[PDB]
Amino acid sequence: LTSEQRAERERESQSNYADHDLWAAPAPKLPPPSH
Amino acid sequence: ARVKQKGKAGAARIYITRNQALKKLQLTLADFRRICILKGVYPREPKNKKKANKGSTAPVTFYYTKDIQYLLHEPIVQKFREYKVFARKLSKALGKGELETAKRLEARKPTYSLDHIIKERYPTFHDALKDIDDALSMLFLFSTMPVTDKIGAATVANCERLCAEFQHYVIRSNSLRKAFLSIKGIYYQAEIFGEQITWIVPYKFAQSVPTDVDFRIMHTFLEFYQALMGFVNFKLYNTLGLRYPPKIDVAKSESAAGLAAYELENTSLFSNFTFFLSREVPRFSLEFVIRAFGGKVGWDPILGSGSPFSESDPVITHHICDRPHISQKYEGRIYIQPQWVYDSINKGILERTDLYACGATLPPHLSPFVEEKEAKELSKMMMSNKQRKLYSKLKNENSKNENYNNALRNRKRDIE
Amino acid sequence: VKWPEYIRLQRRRKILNLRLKVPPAIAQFQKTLDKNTATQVFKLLNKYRPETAAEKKQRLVAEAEAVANGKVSKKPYNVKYGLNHVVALIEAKKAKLVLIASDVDPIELVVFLPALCKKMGVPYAIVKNKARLGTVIHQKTAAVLAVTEVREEDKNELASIVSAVDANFSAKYDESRRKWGGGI
Amino acid sequence: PEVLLKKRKVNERTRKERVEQAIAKKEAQKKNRKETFKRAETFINNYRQRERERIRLNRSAKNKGDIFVPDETKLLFVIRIAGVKNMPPKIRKVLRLLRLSRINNAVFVRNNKAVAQMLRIVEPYVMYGIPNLHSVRELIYKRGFGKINGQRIALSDNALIEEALGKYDVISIEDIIHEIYNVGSHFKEVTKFLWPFTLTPVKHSLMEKKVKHFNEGRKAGYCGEEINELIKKQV
RNA sequence: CAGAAUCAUCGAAUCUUUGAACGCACGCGCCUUUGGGUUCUACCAAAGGCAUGCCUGUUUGAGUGUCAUU
RNA sequence: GGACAUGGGUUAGUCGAUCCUAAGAGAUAGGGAAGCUCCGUAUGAAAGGCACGAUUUUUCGUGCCUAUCGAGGG
Numbered sequence A: 001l002t003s004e005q006r007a008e009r010e011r012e013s014q015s016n017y018a019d020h021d022l023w024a025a026p027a028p029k030l031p032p033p034s035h
Numbered sequence B: 001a002r003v004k005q006k007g008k009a010g011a012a013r014i015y016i017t018r019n020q021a022l023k024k025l026q027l028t029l030a031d032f033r034r035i036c037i038l039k040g041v042y043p044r045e046p047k048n049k050k051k052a053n054k055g056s057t058a059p060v061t062f063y064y065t066k067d068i069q070y071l072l073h074e075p076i077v078q079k080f081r082e083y084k085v086f087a088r089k090l091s092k093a094l095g096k097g098e099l100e101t102a103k104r105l106e107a108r109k110p111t112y113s114l115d116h117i118i119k120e121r122y123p124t125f126h127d128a129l130k131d132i133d134d135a136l137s138m139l140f141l142f143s144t145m146p147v148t149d150k151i152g153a154a155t156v157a158n159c160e161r162l163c164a165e166f167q168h169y170v171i172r173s174n175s176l177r178k179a180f181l182s183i184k185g186i187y188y189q190a191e192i193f194g195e196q197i198t199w200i201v202p203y204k205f206a207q208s209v210p211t212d213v214d215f216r217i218m219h220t221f222l223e224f225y226q227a228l229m230g231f232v233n234f235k236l237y238n239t240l241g242l243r244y245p246p247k248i249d250v251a252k253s254e255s256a257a258g259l260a261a262y263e264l265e266n267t268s269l270f271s272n273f274t275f276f277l278s279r280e281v282p283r284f285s286l287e288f289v290i291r292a293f294g295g296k297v298g299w300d301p302i303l304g305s306g307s308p309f310s311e312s313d314p315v316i317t318h319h320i321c322d323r324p325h326i327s328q329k330y331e332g333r334i335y336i337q338p339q340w341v342y343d344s345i346n347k348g349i350l351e352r353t354d355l356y357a358c359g360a361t362l363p364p365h366l367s368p369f370v371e372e373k374e375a376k377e378l379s380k381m382m383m384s385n386k387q388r389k390l391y392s393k394l395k396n397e398n399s400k401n402e403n404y405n406n407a408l409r410n411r412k413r414d415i416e
Numbered sequence C: 001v002k003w004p005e006y007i008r009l010q011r012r013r014k015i016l017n018l019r020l021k022v023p024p025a026i027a028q029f030q031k032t033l034d035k036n037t038a039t040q041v042f043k044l045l046n047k048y049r050p051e052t053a054a055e056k057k058q059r060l061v062a063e064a065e066a067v068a069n070g071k072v073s074k075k076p077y078n079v080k081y082g083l084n085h086v087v088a089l090i091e092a093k094k095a096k097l098v099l100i101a102s103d104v105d106p107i108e109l110v111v112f113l114p115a116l117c118k119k120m121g122v123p124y125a126i127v128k129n130k131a132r133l134g135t136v137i138h139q140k141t142a143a144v145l146a147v148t149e150v151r152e153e154d155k156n157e158l159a160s161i162v163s164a165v166d167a168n169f170s171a172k173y174d175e176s177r178r179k180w181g182g183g184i
Numbered sequence D: 001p002e003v004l005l006k007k008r009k010v011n012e013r014t015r016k017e018r019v020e021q022a023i024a025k026k027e028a029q030k031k032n033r034k035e036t037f038k039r040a041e042t043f044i045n046n047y048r049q050r051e052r053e054r055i056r057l058n059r060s061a062k063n064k065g066d067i068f069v070p071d072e073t074k075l076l077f078v079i080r081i082a083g084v085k086n087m088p089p090k091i092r093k094v095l096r097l098l099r100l101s102r103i104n105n106a107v108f109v110r111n112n113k114a115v116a117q118m119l120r121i122v123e124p125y126v127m128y129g130i131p132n133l134h135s136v137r138e139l140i141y142k143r144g145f146g147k148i149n150g151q152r153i154a155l156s157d158n159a160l161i162e163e164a165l166g167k168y169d170v171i172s173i174e175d176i177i178h179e180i181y182n183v184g185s186h187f188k189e190v191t192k193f194l195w196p197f198t199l200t201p202v203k204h205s206l207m208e209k210k211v212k213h214f215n216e217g218r219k220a221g222y223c224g225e226e227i228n229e230l231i232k233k234q235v
Numbered sequence E: 001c002a003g004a005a006u007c008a009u010c011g012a013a014u015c016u017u018u019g020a021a022c023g024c025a026c027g028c029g030c031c032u033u034u035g036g037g038u039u040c041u042a043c044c045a046a047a048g049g050c051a052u053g054c055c056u057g058u059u060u061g062a063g064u065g066u067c068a069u070u
Numbered sequence F: 001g002g003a004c005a006u007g008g009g010u011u012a013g014u015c016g017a018u019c020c021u022a023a024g025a026g027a028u029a030g031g032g033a034a035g036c037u038c039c040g041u042a043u044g045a046a047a048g049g050c051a052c053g054a055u056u057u058u059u060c061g062u063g064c065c066u067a068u069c070g071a072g073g074g
Helices: A005-014 B018-025 B030-038 B065-072 B076-096 B100-106 B115-120 B125-130 B133-142 B153-173 B213-237 B283-291 B338-347 B389-415 C005-019 C022-030 C033-044 C055-069 C083-092 C115-122 C130-136 C152-171 D013-034 D040-061 D089-097 D113-121 D134-143 D158-168 D173-182 D187-193 D226-234
Strands: B016-017 B062-064 B176-180 B185-192 B196-200 B274-277 B295-298 B316-320 C097-100 C144-147 D076-078 D107-111 D124-130 D144-150 D150-156
Touching: A005 C055, B016 B018, B016 B065, B018 B030, B018 B062, B018 B065, B030 B076, B030 B213, B030 B295, B062 B065, B115 B133, B115 B213, B125 B196, B125 B213, B133 B153, B133 B196, B133 B213, B153 B213, B153 B283, B153 D226, B176 B283, B176 B338, B274 B283, B283 B295, B283 B338, B316 B338, C005 C097, C022 C115, C033 C130, C033 C144, C033 C152, C083 C144, C097 C115, C097 C152, C130 C144, D040 D113, D076 D226, D089 D113, D107 D113, D107 D134, D107 D187, D124 D226, D134 D173, D134 D226, D144 D158, D144 D187, D158 D173, D158 D187, D173 D187
Parallel strands: B274 B295, B274 B316
Antiparallel strands: B016 B062, B176 B185, B185 B196, C097 C144, D076 D107, D076 D124, D144 D150
């Protein structure tokens, strides 16, 4: 890849924010509600 | 067979101390906590302590051996060492003066993704919705904190991005149910997919850091939750048909536009109502709460651009304002206090405006989440394990407060 | 404190060098360039560092794409390193200043260098440690560096340094280089 | 189905003992890092800077009594990038006149002929630009500090703002930002009350904690709206 | 005696305990994962592992070995 | 018949071995030897683990202690 494609592909990297869906140890005992 | 030795099975075998768990995994304490934070790991107190400690007595934290052996094969543990490798190579480059291999190394710094952590920790979406309340409280808390050396700026940007997208979701889904107020902040409460979600929003304020919180821990939790938020919101938007992540306009966002930057390309309690936001109120909380119930919302331009209304438009049904003085008071925009809105939210009923009007006494707020001698002396002595103490603990603090607050009503009527 | 067999080996060897009657040719490699001139020497040298294998490629791709689409230079100026390459340069009198690593492991390599550089009249100095000379050229270690030719902009700086090495290294010592070292 | 969370296994007794020992060891180190040497080179460098600075003042004041007067903003934002040891007497007073007595201090200034002139005098030491409403909002709401009775007081209560600024129709934090961005009549009083902010450069990634004299590449002079982005990174 | 073959051919496999013989000895352990039970913090089973000398590389280091850092 | 022919028979948590060492054998660290091999086992060996800690620069800091086979022992 020449200088520019590797540069623009470098920008297209470093980007991974919620692209796919995963969903196709007791409970932490949630804190008591407001009093 | 031989005489089996002491502590070769049972509670002296499964329960393994923290120091042993360190040398079994070959980790330092700080890394061990990190993999304990990321995974679901927590001490478990053995029933028989000195039995479980090879006859010792000193107080020591214990873990399940089965739990530790799971951490032995965790693939991310390697990415901890690869960063220990990376740090030394970047120190090497700066030492020799390679200000370029330093720049390329930092570009190719090792990464780990919590995708398999989330799947193995929360299998079902309902599992996530149950154990996500602290995540909402966490991320929302951080979006109003000045960026420090311990917490990077981009992490704050991740909080603000993920915080707003969730606010957009609830307004779009109309899933907001209650919104309680307190000196802690604005205790929000919604429900999604049947499960109930609750959190607390800090007052957006020029706070101070107490210089005793160990920010290292708090940094890993963000590195955990900010992974959770992306994938939880992703399913919600796909379920709602929205394209995740919603697009954000930089120019709008740098004008304090709040949710206006992002485009999403008794639910009707305030459907037929138009509200205006004056320049003294918590716009961030009020924008979210009113639009959750169909309220048409405009705000003062000094709070941010993107206001659909101006000041002069009389279509506003209620011009909310807590300022003690209103020089240019309008008509048709009956002026009430913000406590009116949350009271309407809790009750799901249009509250009375004039009692909450400007200069009026504030009504109190309600939290929406909230022979005898012989028969009492025989079981106190003629029984063994003494669960009779349950009354002395459970009933005592309930009886005293019930007696106390019942006397409040009588004493307050006397005052009147 | 029972030392390891190799800690004992390291330290006994160090003590041995300071005790024996070191020959003059090996004795000169113990009295070296001072610290102030050492950083000044390397201030210049770190201008003429040869480009790394990372830079030598990123540059050559730029020419390749220029040729691949549609399409000459000036002599590359940098520092000369390598024992055979440098030893040739002194003999060919192409070297302006030679910097000799003070602690080369088989001392046979550089033991003849001060005599040869004196013979051809090349101003030389024995800079402390090879790893300093290694980092200038992007290597683990350099037995010897040499400045052969600098741009006109820095021609004055090199001349200033050369007179310092004369005054601080060769003007000083000189006679002490002809005495058997060690024996302490 | 009841997972009782017990008390921490942390032994808060030893934790604070370690903390106190940590503080005890830290103060000794500061009291030990004393009276370092100074080379003959830095004495030169100060002199070269001082004559370089002094000549700049003469050319700036004499024959150059002209200012380009940045327009379309009544309010500017100025921060001090760096200072020179053995400060020139003129700059030493002027920086105090702008309340920038210490480095990394952030102060708002109303744009006019006079202020821009003093900024032009101290230009090589300050990075100044035009903040946007949002950038000013986070500054007050995350780093705003008050001067109540003359101590270092955080703007933690709106009651304090009303108490000290009631007679100038300033009641709340939101009143402060609206006044400052609009530069009203009480702009001078509010700016007098406001304690200067401290935008110390942030060091998060490993490369920054190691490069020497890292200041995020802060230049000196006009930066337009880049100061907004710098604030966004900084706040 | 009561697609065959006590067949040929041979590119796919199986190849018990050993033996240079290699977890340790001539029976006893450790390590990682998986399973079982009308018994589940116990017990058991199973599969896969653990010889030394050397070479390249890797990671973690030691050194009053050499030296640098206003 | 102890011959061959044809079958059957030794059941263990508690009895012994397996568990241990003695004199010595003895691998290793080393060192000899052209070499098969030899000497050496406390030897100028970096020869085994314990605890502590809101997590420490989100790169481990601080503190303590110093082989093996071989039958009377169980």
